[PDB]
Amino acid sequence: TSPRLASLFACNRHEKFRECVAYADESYAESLEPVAISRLAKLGSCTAVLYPQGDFDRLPATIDGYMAFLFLDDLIDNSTDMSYISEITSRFMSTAKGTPTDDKRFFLLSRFFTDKRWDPQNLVLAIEEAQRFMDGALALRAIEIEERIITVEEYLDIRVPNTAMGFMFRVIGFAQPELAEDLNRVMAEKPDLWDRVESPSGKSVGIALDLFKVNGLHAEVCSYTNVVKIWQRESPVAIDLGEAIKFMVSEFYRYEKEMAEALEELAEFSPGLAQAVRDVQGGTLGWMNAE
Ligand SMILES: CC(C)=CCC/C(C)=C/CC/C(C)=C/CC/C(C)=C(\F)COP(=O)(O)OP(=O)(O)O
Ligand SMILES: [Mg+2]
Ligand SMILES: [Mg+2]
Numbered sequence: 001t002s003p004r005l006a007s008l009f010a011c012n013r014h015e016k017f018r019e020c021v022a023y024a025d026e027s028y029a030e031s032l033e034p035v036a037i038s039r040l041a042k043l044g045s046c047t048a049v050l051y052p053q054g055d056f057d058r059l060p061a062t063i064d065g066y067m068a069f070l071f072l073d074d075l076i077d078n079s080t081d082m083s084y085i086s087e088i089t090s091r092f093m094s095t096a097k098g099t100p101t102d103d104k105r106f107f108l109l110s111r112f113f114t115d116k117r118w119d120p121q122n123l124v125l126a127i128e129e130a131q132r133f134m135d136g137a138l139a140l141r142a143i144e145i146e147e148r149i150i151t152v153e154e155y156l157d158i159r160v161p162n163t164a165m166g167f168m169f170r171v172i173g174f175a176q177p178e179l180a181e182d183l184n185r186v187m188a189e190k191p192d193l194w195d196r197v198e199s200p201s202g203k204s205v206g207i208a209l210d211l212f213k214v215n216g217l218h219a220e221v222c223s224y225t226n227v228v229k230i231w232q233r234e235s236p237v238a239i240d241l242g243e244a245i246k247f248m249v250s251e252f253y254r255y256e257k258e259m260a261e262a263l264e265e266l267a268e269f270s271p272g273l274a275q276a277v278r279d280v281q282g283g284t285l286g287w288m289n290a291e
Pocket of ligand 1: 043046066067069070073074077162163164165167168205209210284287288
C-alpha cells in the first residue's frame with residue numbers, strides 16, 4: 001500500500017557498486033552480526049547510490065558509519081520511554097565526538113566519526129547535524145508518549161533533521177572530498193540558500209518515509225508522529241487513510257519541486273555540490289522504492 005514515488009532526481013550508481021556490496025556483507029558479518037539479534041548489509045548498495053561521484057576509498061568507512069547509524073536509530077525508534085532513548089542518544093553523541101567506547105554496538109560509529117581523513121570543519125558540521133537528528137528523535141517520542149496532537153507544519157519542522165537528509169548532505173564532504181571546501185563555504189557564506197535546499201529535502205523524504213510505514217508486527221500505528229495520520233486529524237473535512245495518503249503524495253511532489261528550484265540556485269554557487277545533493281536525494285528515493 002502507499003504508492004511508489006518517482007523522484008525528480010535520477011538514481012545514479014557508483015561504478016564500484018559491486019565492491020561496495022560485499023564490503024558491506026563482509027563488514028556486517030564481522031562487526032555487527034554478533035550483537036545485532038538483518039537488512040543492515042543492504043547499506044552497501046545504498047552508499048553506492050548516495051555518493052555515485054564519491055571517492056571509492058571513502059565509501060567503506062561511510063558504509064560502516066551508516067550501518068551503525070541505522071542500527072542505533074532502530075534502538076531509538078523502538079524505545080517506549082524517554083529515559084532509555086535519552087541514554088542511547090547521549091551515548092551516540094559522545095561517540096560522534098570521539099569519546100572511547102568498548103560497547104560493540106557503537107564500534108563502527110566510532111570508526112566513522114574518528115576517521116582521520118575528515119575535513120575538520122566538515123566533521124564539526126556532521127556532529128552538529130547529528131545532534132539535530134537526535135534532538136528530533138527525542139522530541140518526536142515525547143509527542144507520541146504525551147499523545148500530543150500537532151499540525152503537519154509543526155511535525156515536518158521537527159521531522160526534517162530526523163530524516164538524516166541533512167546528515168547525508170554533510171557527509172558528501174567525506175565521501176566526495178573535492179566538495180569539502182564548497183560545503184564549508186555555503187554554510188559560512190550562504191546559510192539561507194543552503195536551508196532552502198535542505199528544508200524541502202527533509203520534508204519530502206520525511207513524507208516518503210512516513211508513507212512507506214504502516215503495519216507489520218501487530219500495530220505500529222504511530223498515530224501522533226506519522227504525517228498521514230497527523231493530516232487525517234488536521235483536515236477540515238473527514239478523510240480516510242486512503243485519501244490522506246493521496247494528499248501527502250501530492251505534497252511529496254510539491255516539496256521536491258521546491259527543492260529542485262533551490263538546487264538551481266545552489267548550482268550557480270557550486271555545480272558539483274548541487275549535483276551531489278541531487279544524487280543523495282535521487283538514490284535515497286531510488287533505494288527506498290524497494291517497498
Ligand atoms: C537515509 C534514509 C533517510 C533512508 C535510506 C538510506 C539509509 C538506510 C541510510 C542510512 C543513514 C542514516 C543516518 C540512517 C538512520 C536514520 C534514518 C533516516 C532511518 F533509519 C530511516 O529508516 P527507517 O525508515 O527505518 O526510519 P525513520 O527515519 O522513518 O524513523
Ligand atoms: Mg528515525
Ligand atoms: Mg527508524
